Short mmCIF file of C-alpha atoms and ligand atoms in Angstrom, two decimals:
data_model
loop_
_atom_site.label_atom_id
_atom_site.label_comp_id
_atom_site.label_asym_id
_atom_site.label_seq_id
_atom_site.Cartn_x
_atom_site.Cartn_y
_atom_site.Cartn_z
CA UNK A 1 0.00 0.00 0.00
CA UNK A 2 1.50 3.32 -1.09
CA UNK A 3 1.22 6.25 1.29
CA UNK A 4 2.39 9.79 1.69
CA UNK A 5 3.00 11.63 4.95
CA UNK A 6 2.37 15.37 5.06
CA UNK A 7 4.43 17.42 7.51
CA UNK A 8 2.66 20.21 9.44
CA UNK A 9 2.25 23.31 7.25
CA UNK A 10 2.84 26.56 9.11
CA UNK A 11 1.18 28.85 6.60
CA UNK A 12 -0.06 28.81 3.03
CA UNK A 13 0.29 31.63 0.55
CA UNK A 14 0.69 31.89 -3.19
CA UNK A 15 -0.87 31.31 -6.56
CA UNK A 16 -2.07 28.14 -8.22
CA UNK A 17 -2.84 27.88 -11.96
CA UNK A 18 -5.66 25.37 -11.90
CA UNK A 19 -5.77 22.14 -13.87
CA UNK A 20 -8.72 22.01 -16.30
CA UNK A 21 -12.27 21.27 -15.22
CA UNK A 22 -13.15 17.57 -15.40
CA UNK A 23 -16.86 18.39 -15.94
CA UNK A 24 -16.15 20.76 -18.83
CA UNK A 25 -13.38 18.59 -20.28
CA UNK A 26 -15.44 15.48 -20.77
CA UNK A 27 -18.47 17.32 -22.09
CA UNK A 28 -16.27 19.26 -24.55
CA UNK A 29 -14.59 16.10 -25.77
CA UNK A 30 -17.82 14.23 -26.38
CA UNK A 31 -19.48 17.19 -28.10
CA UNK A 32 -16.33 17.86 -30.18
CA UNK A 33 -16.38 14.21 -31.27
CA UNK A 34 -20.05 14.39 -32.31
CA UNK A 35 -19.69 17.78 -33.99
CA UNK A 36 -18.79 18.75 -37.54
CA UNK A 37 -15.41 20.42 -37.93
CA UNK A 38 -12.18 20.50 -35.98
CA UNK A 39 -12.27 21.64 -32.40
CA UNK A 40 -9.16 22.77 -30.56
CA UNK A 41 -9.51 22.45 -26.78
CA UNK A 42 -6.97 24.21 -24.59
CA UNK A 43 -6.47 23.85 -20.82
CA UNK A 44 -7.98 20.38 -21.12
CA UNK A 45 -7.58 18.32 -17.92
CA UNK A 46 -5.13 15.42 -17.95
CA UNK A 47 -6.54 12.99 -15.35
CA UNK A 48 -7.98 9.47 -15.26
CA UNK A 49 -11.54 10.60 -15.99
CA UNK A 50 -10.51 12.48 -19.11
CA UNK A 51 -8.07 9.76 -20.19
CA UNK A 52 -10.93 7.23 -20.14
CA UNK A 53 -13.04 9.51 -22.34
CA UNK A 54 -10.10 9.99 -24.73
CA UNK A 55 -9.52 6.24 -24.88
CA UNK A 56 -13.23 5.68 -25.56
CA UNK A 57 -13.13 8.16 -28.42
CA UNK A 58 -10.04 6.47 -29.85
CA UNK A 59 -11.80 3.09 -29.66
CA UNK A 60 -14.86 4.52 -31.41
CA UNK A 61 -12.66 5.70 -34.25
CA UNK A 62 -12.46 9.40 -33.50
CA UNK A 63 -9.22 11.04 -34.66
CA UNK A 64 -7.43 13.59 -32.43
CA UNK A 65 -4.00 14.74 -31.33
CA UNK A 66 -2.73 15.83 -27.92
CA UNK A 67 0.01 18.27 -26.96
CA UNK A 68 2.98 17.08 -24.89
CA UNK A 69 1.29 17.95 -21.60
CA UNK A 70 -2.02 16.53 -22.78
CA UNK A 71 -3.79 19.86 -22.15
CA UNK A 72 -4.29 20.86 -25.80
CA UNK A 73 -6.43 18.56 -27.95
CA UNK A 74 -7.23 18.96 -31.64
CA UNK A 75 -10.31 16.84 -32.31
CA UNK A 76 -11.59 15.92 -35.79
CA UNK A 77 -15.36 15.88 -35.39
CA UNK A 78 -17.26 12.82 -36.56
CA UNK A 79 -20.12 14.89 -37.93
CA UNK A 80 -22.77 12.88 -36.16
CA UNK A 81 -23.39 9.99 -33.70
CA UNK A 82 -20.42 7.74 -32.93
CA UNK A 83 -20.59 4.08 -33.90
CA UNK A 84 -19.10 0.67 -33.19
CA UNK A 85 -20.35 -2.93 -33.29
CA UNK A 86 -19.32 -6.36 -32.05
CA UNK A 87 -20.12 -5.54 -28.44
CA UNK A 88 -16.96 -3.37 -28.39
CA UNK A 89 -16.01 -2.92 -24.76
CA UNK A 90 -15.23 0.59 -23.52
CA UNK A 91 -13.57 0.69 -20.11
CA UNK A 92 -14.46 3.88 -18.27
CA UNK A 93 -12.69 3.53 -14.91
CA UNK A 94 -14.95 5.19 -12.37
CA UNK A 95 -15.73 8.25 -14.50
CA UNK A 96 -19.40 9.04 -14.10
CA UNK A 97 -19.21 11.95 -16.53
CA UNK A 98 -17.88 9.57 -19.19
CA UNK A 99 -20.18 6.65 -18.31
CA UNK A 100 -23.46 8.51 -18.06
CA UNK A 101 -23.03 10.75 -21.17
CA UNK A 102 -21.74 7.89 -23.33
CA UNK A 103 -24.49 5.54 -22.19
CA UNK A 104 -26.97 7.99 -23.67
CA UNK A 105 -25.04 9.15 -26.71
CA UNK A 106 -24.23 5.70 -27.96
CA UNK A 107 -27.93 4.83 -28.01
CA UNK A 108 -28.27 6.94 -31.18
CA UNK A 109 -28.80 4.88 -34.32
CA UNK A 110 -27.60 1.29 -34.31
CA UNK A 111 -24.66 0.09 -32.24
CA UNK A 112 -23.48 -2.86 -30.19
CA UNK A 113 -21.26 -1.48 -27.49
CA UNK A 114 -20.54 -2.46 -23.90
CA UNK A 115 -19.73 0.15 -21.27
CA UNK A 116 -17.96 -1.02 -18.13
CA UNK A 117 -15.47 0.19 -15.54
CA UNK A 118 -13.82 -0.45 -12.21
CA UNK A 119 -15.56 -2.51 -9.53
CA UNK A 120 -16.98 0.56 -7.80
CA UNK A 121 -18.52 1.77 -11.07
CA UNK A 122 -20.49 -1.47 -11.21
CA UNK A 123 -21.99 -0.34 -7.89
CA UNK A 124 -22.94 3.20 -8.96
CA UNK A 125 -26.56 3.57 -10.15
CA UNK A 126 -27.57 4.23 -13.73
CA UNK A 127 -31.09 2.80 -13.77
CA UNK A 128 -32.78 6.20 -13.91
CA UNK A 129 -30.93 6.98 -17.12
CA UNK A 130 -31.54 3.53 -18.64
CA UNK A 131 -35.26 3.90 -17.81
CA UNK A 132 -35.39 7.26 -19.64
CA UNK A 133 -33.39 6.04 -22.68
CA UNK A 134 -35.70 3.03 -23.01
CA UNK A 135 -38.79 5.25 -22.96
CA UNK A 136 -37.13 7.00 -25.90
CA UNK A 137 -36.68 3.74 -27.77
CA UNK A 138 -33.24 2.52 -26.74
CA UNK A 139 -32.36 -1.15 -26.35
CA UNK A 140 -30.16 -1.52 -23.26
CA UNK A 141 -29.19 -4.65 -21.36
CA UNK A 142 -27.74 -4.90 -17.85
CA UNK A 143 -24.97 -7.48 -18.11
CA UNK A 144 -24.54 -7.89 -14.36
CA UNK A 145 -26.61 -6.27 -11.62
CA UNK A 146 -29.87 -4.67 -12.72
CA UNK A 147 -29.69 -0.83 -12.50
CA UNK A 148 -25.89 -0.66 -12.72
CA UNK A 149 -23.11 -0.83 -15.32
CA UNK A 150 -21.97 -2.76 -17.23
CA UNK A 151 -24.45 -2.01 -20.01
CA UNK A 152 -24.75 -3.45 -23.49
CA UNK A 153 -26.11 -0.70 -25.77
CA UNK A 154 -27.81 -1.73 -28.99
CA UNK A 155 -29.23 1.61 -30.03
CA UNK A 156 -32.65 2.81 -31.03
CA UNK A 157 -33.11 6.06 -29.11
CA UNK A 158 -35.35 8.07 -31.46
CA UNK A 159 -36.79 10.68 -29.05
CA UNK A 160 -40.36 11.29 -27.94
CA UNK A 161 -41.71 11.85 -24.44
CA UNK A 162 -39.11 10.79 -21.89
CA UNK A 163 -39.45 10.96 -18.10
CA UNK A 164 -36.30 11.01 -16.01
CA UNK A 165 -35.72 10.84 -12.27
CA UNK A 166 -33.42 13.67 -11.22
CA UNK A 167 -33.34 12.86 -7.50
CA UNK A 168 -30.13 10.77 -7.39
CA UNK A 169 -27.92 12.24 -10.12
CA UNK A 170 -28.11 15.24 -12.41
CA UNK A 171 -25.86 13.29 -14.78
CA UNK A 172 -28.77 11.29 -16.12
CA UNK A 173 -30.52 14.48 -17.30
CA UNK A 174 -27.21 15.85 -18.59
CA UNK A 175 -26.73 12.71 -20.63
CA UNK A 176 -30.21 12.98 -22.10
CA UNK A 177 -29.78 16.66 -22.90
CA UNK A 178 -26.58 16.13 -24.89
CA UNK A 179 -28.01 13.19 -26.83
CA UNK A 180 -31.55 14.32 -27.68
CA UNK A 181 -30.66 17.05 -30.24
CA UNK A 182 -29.18 14.37 -32.50
CA UNK A 183 -32.21 12.06 -32.26
CA UNK A 184 -34.49 11.97 -35.33
CA UNK A 185 -37.64 13.02 -33.48
CA UNK A 186 -38.25 15.86 -31.02
CA UNK A 187 -37.90 14.92 -27.36
CA UNK A 188 -39.72 16.26 -24.30
CA UNK A 189 -37.75 15.40 -21.14
CA UNK A 190 -39.92 15.58 -18.02
CA UNK A 191 -38.25 15.58 -14.58
CA UNK A 192 -40.18 13.24 -12.26
CA UNK A 193 -39.66 15.03 -8.99
CA UNK A 194 -36.68 16.68 -7.33
CA UNK A 195 -33.51 17.62 -9.23
CA UNK A 196 -30.21 17.42 -7.37
CA UNK A 197 -26.88 19.02 -8.36
CA UNK A 198 -28.79 21.52 -10.45
CA UNK A 199 -25.77 23.72 -11.36
CA UNK A 200 -24.30 20.91 -13.43
CA UNK A 201 -27.32 21.10 -15.72
CA UNK A 202 -26.31 24.70 -16.44
CA UNK A 203 -22.80 23.53 -17.37
CA UNK A 204 -24.33 21.06 -19.82
CA UNK A 205 -26.58 23.64 -21.46
CA UNK A 206 -23.67 26.08 -21.65
CA UNK A 207 -21.47 23.56 -23.48
CA UNK A 208 -24.30 22.49 -25.82
CA UNK A 209 -24.81 26.12 -26.82
CA UNK A 210 -21.08 26.56 -27.45
CA UNK A 211 -21.39 23.62 -29.82
CA UNK A 212 -24.38 25.19 -31.55
CA UNK A 213 -27.44 23.75 -29.85
CA UNK A 214 -30.07 25.33 -27.63
CA UNK A 215 -33.19 23.81 -26.12
CA UNK A 216 -36.25 25.01 -24.23
CA UNK A 217 -35.78 24.80 -20.50
CA UNK A 218 -39.11 25.11 -18.69
CA UNK A 219 -38.01 25.95 -15.13
CA UNK A 220 -35.92 22.77 -14.98
CA UNK A 221 -39.09 20.68 -14.77
CA UNK A 222 -39.31 19.93 -18.47
CA UNK A 223 -36.92 20.39 -21.39
CA UNK A 224 -38.13 20.59 -24.96
CA UNK A 225 -35.56 19.49 -27.55
CA UNK A 226 -35.88 19.64 -31.31
CA UNK A 227 -34.38 16.61 -33.01
CA UNK A 228 -32.42 16.44 -36.26
CA UNK A 229 -29.82 18.92 -35.09
CA UNK A 230 -26.08 18.86 -35.52
CA UNK A 231 -23.31 19.99 -33.22
CA UNK A 232 -20.75 22.36 -34.80
CA UNK A 233 -17.16 22.98 -33.82
CA UNK A 234 -16.70 26.25 -31.89
CA UNK A 235 -13.14 26.52 -33.25
CA UNK A 236 -10.75 27.12 -30.34
CA UNK A 237 -12.28 26.62 -26.91
CA UNK A 238 -10.72 27.32 -23.51
CA UNK A 239 -11.62 24.81 -20.82
CA UNK A 240 -12.18 26.59 -17.50
CA UNK A 241 -9.90 25.71 -14.57
CA UNK A 242 -11.49 23.22 -12.17
CA UNK A 243 -13.48 24.96 -9.43
CA UNK A 244 -13.74 21.75 -7.39
CA UNK A 245 -9.96 21.30 -7.53
CA UNK A 246 -9.68 24.94 -6.45
CA UNK A 247 -11.58 24.30 -3.20
CA UNK A 248 -8.62 22.75 -1.41
CA UNK A 249 -6.37 25.72 -2.00
CA UNK A 250 -8.94 28.36 -1.12
CA UNK A 251 -9.88 26.40 2.02
CA UNK A 252 -6.20 26.08 2.90
CA UNK A 253 -5.96 29.89 3.00
CA UNK A 254 -9.16 30.14 5.01
CA UNK A 255 -7.53 27.85 7.57
CA UNK A 256 -3.84 28.80 7.50
CA UNK A 257 -3.24 31.78 5.21
CA UNK A 258 -1.97 34.03 4.03
CA UNK A 259 -3.65 34.63 0.68
CA UNK A 260 -4.04 31.91 -1.94
CA UNK A 261 -5.08 32.86 -5.44
CA UNK A 262 -6.29 30.29 -7.92
CA UNK A 263 -6.26 31.20 -11.60
CA UNK A 264 -8.28 29.78 -14.45
CA UNK A 265 -11.67 30.47 -12.85
CA UNK A 266 -13.30 33.73 -11.94
CA UNK A 267 -16.56 35.56 -11.35
CA UNK A 268 -17.82 34.62 -14.79
CA UNK A 269 -17.28 30.87 -14.45
CA UNK A 270 -20.08 28.46 -15.38
CA UNK A 271 -19.13 25.99 -12.62
CA UNK A 272 -21.37 25.86 -9.59
CA UNK A 273 -18.44 25.04 -7.34
CA UNK A 274 -17.18 28.61 -7.48
CA UNK A 275 -20.00 29.07 -4.91
CA UNK A 276 -17.71 27.19 -2.52
CA UNK A 277 -15.97 30.56 -2.06
CA UNK A 278 -19.24 31.99 -0.71
CA UNK A 279 -19.25 29.30 1.98
CA UNK A 280 -15.73 30.20 3.08
CA UNK A 281 -16.85 33.83 3.19
CA UNK A 282 -19.78 32.83 5.42
CA UNK A 283 -17.34 31.01 7.70
CA UNK A 284 -15.21 34.14 8.11
CA UNK A 285 -12.65 34.13 5.31
CA UNK A 286 -12.11 37.06 2.90
CA UNK A 287 -12.72 36.37 -0.80
CA UNK A 288 -11.48 38.40 -3.80
CA UNK A 289 -12.98 37.92 -7.25
CA UNK A 290 -11.35 38.63 -10.56
CA UNK A 291 -12.06 37.94 -14.17
CA UNK A 292 -9.62 35.02 -14.21
CA UNK A 293 -9.01 34.37 -10.51
CA UNK A 294 -10.54 33.84 -7.11
CA UNK A 295 -8.50 34.37 -3.97
CA UNK A 296 -9.06 33.67 -0.32
CA UNK A 297 -7.35 35.38 2.61
CA UNK A 298 -7.37 34.12 6.17
CA UNK A 299 -9.91 35.85 8.43
CA UNK A 300 -11.55 33.64 11.00
CA UNK A 301 -13.34 30.35 10.71
CA UNK A 302 -16.77 29.71 12.21
CA UNK A 303 -18.95 26.64 11.86
CA UNK A 304 -21.92 26.72 9.49
CA UNK A 305 -25.12 24.73 9.02
CA UNK A 306 -26.00 24.66 5.33
CA UNK A 307 -27.80 22.77 2.59
CA UNK A 308 -24.94 21.79 0.27
CA UNK A 309 -26.88 20.18 -2.55
CA UNK A 310 -25.67 22.86 -5.01
CA UNK A 311 -21.95 22.07 -4.43
CA UNK A 312 -21.79 18.38 -3.43
CA UNK A 313 -18.16 17.87 -4.45
CA UNK A 314 -16.58 21.01 -3.05
CA UNK A 315 -18.76 20.49 0.03
CA UNK A 316 -16.44 17.65 1.11
CA UNK A 317 -13.73 20.24 1.56
CA UNK A 318 -15.87 22.04 4.15
CA UNK A 319 -16.14 18.73 6.07
CA UNK A 320 -12.39 18.70 6.80
CA UNK A 321 -12.13 22.49 6.99
CA UNK A 322 -14.73 22.14 9.81
CA UNK A 323 -11.96 20.54 11.91
CA UNK A 324 -10.51 24.05 12.21
CA UNK A 325 -13.73 25.98 12.70
CA UNK A 326 -15.30 27.25 15.90
CA UNK A 327 -18.42 25.23 16.71
CA UNK A 328 -20.30 22.36 15.10
CA UNK A 329 -20.66 22.26 11.33
CA UNK A 330 -23.59 20.59 9.64
CA UNK A 331 -23.71 19.85 5.89
CA UNK A 332 -27.17 18.85 4.70
CA UNK A 333 -29.01 17.46 1.69
CA UNK A 334 -26.02 15.52 0.42
CA UNK A 335 -27.48 12.06 0.13
CA UNK A 336 -25.76 11.37 -3.15
CA UNK A 337 -22.35 11.47 -1.52
CA UNK A 338 -23.34 7.81 -0.87
CA UNK A 339 -23.38 6.84 -4.54
CA UNK A 340 -20.18 8.44 -5.80
CA UNK A 341 -16.51 7.34 -5.81
CA UNK A 342 -17.24 5.69 -2.47
CA UNK A 343 -20.04 6.17 0.04
CA UNK A 344 -18.66 9.53 1.08
CA UNK A 345 -20.90 10.02 4.11
CA UNK A 346 -19.61 6.77 5.63
CA UNK A 347 -16.03 7.43 4.51
CA UNK A 348 -15.87 11.06 5.62
CA UNK A 349 -17.41 10.30 9.02
CA UNK A 350 -15.08 7.35 9.57
CA UNK A 351 -11.88 9.21 8.72
CA UNK A 352 -12.84 12.45 10.51
CA UNK A 353 -13.30 10.46 13.72
CA UNK A 354 -9.79 9.07 13.34
CA UNK A 355 -8.26 12.52 13.76
CA UNK A 356 -10.43 13.24 16.81
CA UNK A 357 -13.72 14.75 15.67
CA UNK A 358 -17.08 13.70 17.08
CA UNK A 359 -19.24 13.02 14.02
CA UNK A 360 -22.86 12.19 13.41
CA UNK A 361 -23.21 10.36 10.12
CA UNK A 362 -26.74 11.27 9.12
CA UNK A 363 -28.60 9.50 6.37
CA UNK A 364 -28.17 12.53 4.08
CA UNK A 365 -26.16 14.95 6.21
CA UNK A 366 -23.07 15.03 8.39
CA UNK A 367 -22.53 16.92 11.68
CA UNK A 368 -18.95 17.58 12.75
CA UNK A 369 -17.75 18.75 16.16
CA UNK A 370 -14.03 19.40 16.08
CA UNK A 371 -11.67 18.22 18.80
CA UNK A 372 -9.67 20.66 20.91
CA UNK A 373 -6.65 19.31 19.07
CA UNK A 374 -6.16 16.93 16.18
CA UNK A 375 -4.24 13.72 16.47
CA UNK A 376 -2.21 11.79 13.94
CA UNK A 377 -4.02 9.30 11.75
CA UNK A 378 -3.33 7.11 8.73
CA UNK A 379 -6.22 8.09 6.45
CA UNK A 380 -7.94 5.50 4.24
CA UNK A 381 -8.92 6.99 0.89
CA UNK A 382 -11.46 4.54 -0.57
CA UNK A 383 -10.18 4.93 -4.15
CA UNK A 384 -11.55 8.47 -3.85
CA UNK A 385 -9.46 11.40 -5.05
CA UNK A 386 -11.39 13.76 -2.79
CA UNK A 387 -10.81 11.80 0.40
CA UNK A 388 -7.09 12.22 -0.25
CA UNK A 389 -7.35 15.92 -1.07
CA UNK A 390 -9.78 16.77 1.75
CA UNK A 391 -7.65 15.08 4.40
CA UNK A 392 -4.44 16.71 3.17
CA UNK A 393 -5.86 19.76 5.00
CA UNK A 394 -5.30 18.01 8.33
CA UNK A 395 -1.59 18.99 7.91
CA UNK A 396 -2.57 22.67 8.38
CA UNK A 397 -2.37 21.88 12.10
CA UNK A 398 0.39 20.90 14.54
CA UNK A 399 0.12 17.25 13.48
CA UNK A 400 1.32 15.39 10.40
CA UNK A 401 -1.14 13.12 8.57
CA UNK A 402 -0.46 10.02 6.49
CA UNK A 403 -2.62 9.65 3.40
CA UNK A 404 -2.99 6.11 1.99
CA UNK A 405 -2.89 5.58 -1.81
CA UNK A 406 -2.17 9.26 -2.58
CA UNK A 407 -2.13 8.56 -6.32
CA UNK A 408 -5.92 8.17 -6.16
CA UNK A 409 -5.97 11.95 -6.65
CA UNK A 410 -5.19 11.19 -10.31
CA UNK A 411 -8.91 10.74 -10.99
CA UNK A 412 -9.08 14.52 -11.38
CA UNK A 413 -5.85 16.08 -10.14
CA UNK A 414 -2.64 14.06 -10.63
CA UNK A 415 -0.40 16.89 -9.46
CA UNK A 416 -2.39 17.70 -6.34
CA UNK A 417 0.33 17.20 -3.75
CA UNK A 418 2.99 19.07 -5.65
CA UNK A 419 0.52 21.98 -6.04
CA UNK A 420 -0.36 21.96 -2.31
CA UNK A 421 3.40 21.98 -1.58
CA UNK A 422 3.79 25.01 -3.87
CA UNK A 423 1.68 27.15 -1.55
CA UNK A 424 2.94 25.50 1.69
CA UNK A 425 5.32 27.80 3.59
CA UNK A 426 7.60 27.09 6.52
CA UNK A 427 7.29 30.65 7.72
O1 LIG B 1 -22.13 16.74 -14.38
C1 LIG B 1 -20.99 16.70 -13.87
O2 LIG B 1 -19.97 17.11 -14.41
C2 LIG B 1 -20.87 16.23 -12.44
C3 LIG B 1 -22.04 16.21 -11.64
C4 LIG B 1 -22.01 15.74 -10.20
O3 LIG B 1 -22.71 14.42 -10.06
P1 LIG B 1 -24.30 14.21 -9.46
O4 LIG B 1 -25.26 14.88 -10.36
O5 LIG B 1 -24.56 12.77 -9.41
O6 LIG B 1 -24.32 14.86 -8.09
C5 LIG B 1 -20.57 15.76 -9.63
O7 LIG B 1 -20.59 15.12 -8.35
C6 LIG B 1 -19.56 15.10 -10.59
O8 LIG B 1 -18.24 15.17 -10.03
C7 LIG B 1 -19.59 15.86 -11.92
O1 LIG B 2 -15.61 14.36 -8.63
C1 LIG B 2 -16.34 14.08 -7.61
O2 LIG B 2 -16.17 14.56 -6.49
C2 LIG B 2 -17.49 13.11 -7.78
N1 LIG B 2 -17.54 12.62 -9.15
C3 LIG B 2 -18.48 11.57 -9.51
P1 LIG B 2 -18.36 11.17 -11.19
O3 LIG B 2 -17.43 9.98 -11.32
O4 LIG B 2 -17.77 12.34 -11.91
O5 LIG B 2 -19.77 10.85 -11.57
#
């Protein structure tokens, strides 16, 4: 078992040029592949999730080239739905934003493709999306456990009236939204009840528009899509820096700064996780906004009690930042933490207790009461990049922390530890 031990960090201060957004990267790659024309993506993220999408595109016959650092990609658009037969197997690691979007997109026309991934991916739900795709005409078979990958896709999505449950993942709706425009018939997507992670739907619509397609959003309850459309290359497109990856650095300043500035995202960003900065502000930190940066300067840090459904990923960073706050922090309406890279409510509660916190693991919330002082712990990371990055913050105390399997950060941020070190100061 690999591990990394982080020495106590006395202060953080500096600037970080963010790696590209995973959410934007995978959407841009899939849309560029489906579009007509050549798209040049810059500031693309090089991480496992994007690599799996790139490999999938290669396997489907899409032609593209990558720069030496894998952040510039010149994609030759396919000019329409992607195709493959012979039950071609596409391995997608544990990348939900590759798995969900491709499960929908590859239902267009005829195909015989199998989508699979790591063991955990075979335990992450996809039934709500399969249900919707089938209502639209798709033929989809569960090869193992019903409602989970792996899936054998044999095509047939033509459009029509499609209901979709948006209560567990917004990715199912995102997948439908990107696929529907290319279907032969018009599609009316009706959300069954609640819609979680709503800001990600805005990222999807933003990218679709960049690639030439707009739809009718009726207060996020129903989306009217015209079929027979075509995506078009936007030419050169700059992938925003990752706002979720930025959370660790901004939180580090809130706890132990100093001022930390992250570049690549700013006040105009489409990512909902830039709202993480508003949470740090509510806790007592000072935030500065720019056109291409966000910075955080140490102020004070007070506990908060907030519904975090709008920033589920960056919300994990508040869970460990809470170790340094005054009072008990409560993060609510985050049930789907349970169905992501690992069951994050169980994992976060378990590891937080190891460093001394008293934690109530609620069914869909977590309540954290920090200890007077933290103690050393060897942190399990559950094959979850964010468990490793969130717990790295424990080192902003008088105690070191050992992080197991630190390379798990590669899912979205391979260079995480070197970047944290960049802003770590001895004085
Ligand atoms: O659409 C996207 O890019 C994402 C949506 C979220 O998933 P849920 O909708 O399941 O919360 C998020 O957790 C994931 O990291 C990326
Ligand atoms: O990045 C995160 O925190 C959660 N991601 C889940 P995904 O694999 O992208 O569906």
